[PDB]
Design a binder for this molecule. Sequence first.
Ligand SMILES: NC(=[NH2+])c1ccc2[nH]c(-c3cc([C@@H](CC(=O)[O-])C(=O)[O-])cc(Br)c3[O-])nc2c1
Ligand SMILES: [Ca+2]
Length: 223
Amino acid sequence: IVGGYTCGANTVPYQVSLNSGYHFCGGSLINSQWVVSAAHCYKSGIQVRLGEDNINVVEGNEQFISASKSIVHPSYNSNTLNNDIMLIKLKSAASLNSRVASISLPTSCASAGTQCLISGWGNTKSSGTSYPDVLKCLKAPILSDSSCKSAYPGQITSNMFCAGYLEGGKDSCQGDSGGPVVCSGKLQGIVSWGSGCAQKNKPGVYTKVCNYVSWIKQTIASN
Ligand SMILES: NC(=[NH2+])c1ccc2[nH]c(-c3cc([C@@H](CC(=O)[O-])C(=O)[O-])cc(Br)c3[O-])nc2c1
Ligand SMILES: [Ca+2]
């Protein structure tokens, strides 16, 4: 997260860190046994880390659980990042409490201008890599479809939305991929891609979760 602030330990209780011997992507806990992340974060050997704040130090509240299976959307296109969503089933259920809790799926899509909270342990520099130890937060608004398409002509599908600041300076970045975009207490987006980080006129692009609620429910139900 570039231009964000320190969230504060466990203030984003649905945030998870996907670890394969190091932090590589974020995710969101949607129930005690399932996490939603981005399909481009797929790999084998994933350990899901819940109740984290400082990813380099065990401080208490952490729960490390191996992923039993990862289900990448069948229509995910790695070239366009269309349908960039994946569900991870945990080997055992997480113990939910105040520090570890799930986030609700939306019942409707959000409109442009809605303010949302984006969080993660991704790069904090738009020029160079500087990864933080603790969880960073950023409040960003969802942009209009016309500003989004103007910024990335021919690259935005109906399963994506832009959020951020066209003036640059504040945005999600590499390492934040797979993480949550929460608006009014509902998970509306998944950090997917962008051109660089926090560059002027190049806002972040997010997977539009409201278009996948039925798929998520159907898939969880059958697995
Ligand atoms: N501006 C954003 N909102 C944004 C969000 C997620 C991103 N994820 C990435 C991202 C970048 C890489 C680099 C590779 C590198 O330098 O290691 C690349 O261009 O392929 C790789 C991944 Br995987 C990313 O998710 N950039 C991102 C930018
Ligand atoms: Ca820790």
